[PDB]
């Protein structure tokens, strides 16, 4: 018998429809893809891909928080871009949220994201305590 | 020593080539991406995205079945679309398979799917018994 | 209880330039970063086209698995990202040469673009043995 619980925080855009912000099953946390949406206005923050990336990571942070975790628990992330040329800029924003023991990752350009977003990020985390390498 | 088992069912399109319909390892189930293909035929069902979506999900339901699971065991799903504008049409179909404790999700438009498919869904499940909070 | 989380690193696989690790072992699951057909010593793509890149990408994944004490039989899920869906056949012929039985679950589709102009990228998930199938 494994425990499964739905993560939900008002500090991140509400999950409207048949999905959850994140699902914690046993020790693993699956987080839905996050866009650069402001939790309050439900709209994408202005500024373009760079600011959208900050918000998307902010949203991920709040979800991790609600699950008793922080960015150090992320083991895998997927960076979806609307334009492969934004790779470098998003990478520099991305590194602002991690110190070391970085997560495994995949990054590429898709044809289009919801709401005309320029970037969407999804991740997988493992609830602590963790005994690093 | 972890137990790994290859899932196979006649109720879903046959894995032709170097892959399996799904792999169950320990208690996590990795299900291969499913298109709206007829199990016996192996051909894309006519009708378009809405029809393909129903078939794809049906195929997933059978895979889960053959693994001793149902839709309540799904913790994460990815919805790949040929057109981001078919999301609502697909979402309406998708919601008919879940009652609560919805899976984490990510949806976006890719450039092209196999066989000119209009939608593809991959999912991750965790074999129960499962106790929610 | 405490879980082990180690960063996999090998000079025999392309260096992870950005803020990510080649792979992350957590408990017994190994999340491997998407691999391009890059030469480990130069960090640049291998000449020859999609087929040559695929071979290199898989050998890159091979070295990463080896450093984690695994081989291709430990892969339970793989995702093949293509720059052109029409290259699926050619990539699949190279792919089948690395797996003999109990193939991993899979998902394959075309994206808009990959880093460095690569023609193929493969990400995978493996589980540390001993595994009983």
UniProtKB/Swiss-Prot annotation, chains A, B:
Gene3D superfamilies, alphabetized: RutC-like
GO molecular function: 2-iminobutanoate deaminase activity; 2-iminopropanoate deaminase activity; mRNA binding; RNA endonuclease activity, producing 3'-phosphomonoesters
EC code: 3.5.99.10, 3.1.-.-
Residues the record lists as N6-succinyllysine modifications: 11, 65
Catalytic activity annotation: 2-iminobutanoate + H2O = 2-oxobutanoate + NH4(+); 2-iminopropanoate + H2O = pyruvate + NH4(+)
GO BP: any one term: mRNA destabilization
Tissue: Expressed by various malignant neoplasms.
Gene Ontology CC annotation, any one: mitochondrial matrix
Compartmental location: Cytoplasm; Nucleus; Peroxisome; Mitochondrion
Modified residue annotations for Phosphothreonine: 72
Keywords tagged on the record: Acetylation, Cytoplasm, Hydrolase, Lipid metabolism, Mitochondrion, Nucleus, Peroxisome, Phosphoprotein, RNA-binding
Main location: cytoplasm
Highest taxon in the source lineage: Eukaryota
The UniProt record lists the keyword Kinase: no
NCBIfam families linked to this entry: Rid family detoxifying hydrolase (TIGR00004)
Family: Belongs to the RutC family.
Subunit annotation: Homotrimer. Interacts with YTHDF2.
Biological role stated in the UniProt entry: Catalyzes the hydrolytic deamination of enamine/imine intermediates that form during the course of normal metabolism. May facilitate the release of ammonia from these potentially toxic reactive metabolites, reducing their impact on cellular components. It may act on enamine/imine intermediates formed by several types of pyridoxal-5'-phosphate-dependent dehydratases including L-threonine dehydratase. Also promotes endoribonucleolytic cleavage of some transcripts by promoting recruitment of the ribonuclease P/MRP complex. Acts by bridging YTHDF2 and the ribonuclease P/MRP complex. RIDA/HRSP12 binds to N6-methyladenosine (m6A)-containing mRNAs containing a 5'-GGUUC-3' motif: cooperative binding of RIDA/HRSP12 and YTHDF2 to such transcripts lead to recruitment of the ribonuclease P/MRP complex and subsequent endoribonucleolytic cleavage.
Protein name: 2-iminobutanoate/2-iminopropanoate deaminase
């Amino acid at each position: 018998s494994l425990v499964r619980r739905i993560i939900s925080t008002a500090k991140a855009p509400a999950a409207i429809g048949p999905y959850s912000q994140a699902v914690l099953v046993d020790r693993t946390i699956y987080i839905s893809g996050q866009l650069g949406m402001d939790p309050a206005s439900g709209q994408l923050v202005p500024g373009g891909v760079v600011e959208e990336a900050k918000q998307a990571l902010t949203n991920i942070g709040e979800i991790l928080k609600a699950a008793g975790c922080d960015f150090t628990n992320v083991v895998k992330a997927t960076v979806l871009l609307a334009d492969i040329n934004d790779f470098s800029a998003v990478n520099d924003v991305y590194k602002q949220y991690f110190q070391s023991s970085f997560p495994a990752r995949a990054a590429y350009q898709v044809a289009a994201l919801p709401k005309g977003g320029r970037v969407e990020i999804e991740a997988i985390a493992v609830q602590g305590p963790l005994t690093t390498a």
